[PDB]
Amino acid sequence: DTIDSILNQNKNHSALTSYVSKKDLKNLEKKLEKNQNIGIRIYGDSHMAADFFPRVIRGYLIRSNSIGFAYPLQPKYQQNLNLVYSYKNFEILNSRNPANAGHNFPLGGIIAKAKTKGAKINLDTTLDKKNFKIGFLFKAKQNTNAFSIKDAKNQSYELRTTQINKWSYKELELDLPLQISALQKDAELGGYFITNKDNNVFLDTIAINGAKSDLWLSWNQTVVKKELGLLHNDLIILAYGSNDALFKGFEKQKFKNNLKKWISILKTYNKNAVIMLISPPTVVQKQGKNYKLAPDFFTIRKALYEVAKEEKTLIFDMHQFMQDSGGKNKWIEQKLSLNDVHLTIKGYELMAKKLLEDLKNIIDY
Known part of the structure; x- marks a missing residue:
């Protein structure tokens, strides 16, 4: 009930922002109630690749019967x-x-x-x-x-x-x-x-430890498109940002353009899909001995909100919830977080239950 107590202290301050039309959100809400075909996918990095965060979403947002x-x-x-x-x-x-x-x-x-x-x-x-x-x-x-x-x-x-x-x-x-x-x-x-x-209900993941938002540019685009068409997704989640702040090659417009091309490809290849971006948790990097905020982190987070409005998507801000409940330092003390960008399993389940809470205010499930 450590996760439960923190969610109750922050029940009034959502970390989820919506730029989605009432038509797409309602249509997704209808599939969730119909419990016939609901395909969900999470693209991301290490905050998703070990299935800690997606498992909580898979168990509570849907009644999973497929992979x-x-x-x-x-x-x-x-x-x-x-x-x-x-x-x-x-x-x-x-x-x-x-x-x-x-x-x-x-x-x-x-x-x-x-x-x-x-x-x-x-x-x-x-x-x-x-x-x-x-x-x-x-x-x-x-x-x-x-x-x-x-x-x-x-x-x-x-x-x-x-x-x-x-x-x-x-x-x-x-x-x-x-x-x-x-x-x-x-x-x-x-x-x-x-x-x-x-009648497939599932939540699959395409996540890679240490992946930047533009890792999909590394792949065969013809084969990527063929694979996108093999399995339709009703809800697609993109959880990137951490590794763009930790590794070289970041430029705000190139970051937004590549991500907007990816969103447009996914919406075209998944008709009527609701898109949700997930902004990374408070990204820190080593100072030598110490840890310090990544300078690009606040630019990436702002760029993700801009892309969310431009592409009319949802955006769950993990750093926002981390800051609303004490900050990364308070999360480290309670072993919800580690000293680097990574969180513990308890922190990843607290993040996932927070999204499930904020999702309720816009979607019935």
């Missing part, structure tokens, strides 16, 4: 709590990594590359339902069989490209747990789309 998009393998210290992974002899390529720069990246920028013929990936879900329509994004050096798939029911299948060095897609109706085996070395996996045959 959606998921990485071929989770990068280290990242997770989607709907899924369980294990693998041998697979290399994880990350678009955020400079050492992996120059590859043909799909949506999310994560690639599982078979180090050898016979490399295996085991995939299961934490749900008790195991029958799923699963789409595989794969890529191979030769037009022979790229991967082998065995399901829980012993049905064996093959992933096979018709064009080499091109991201391909293929859907199968399988039962988890399933094992993937590489039939070629250097064969690649780009992600899965795990959905029910109809």
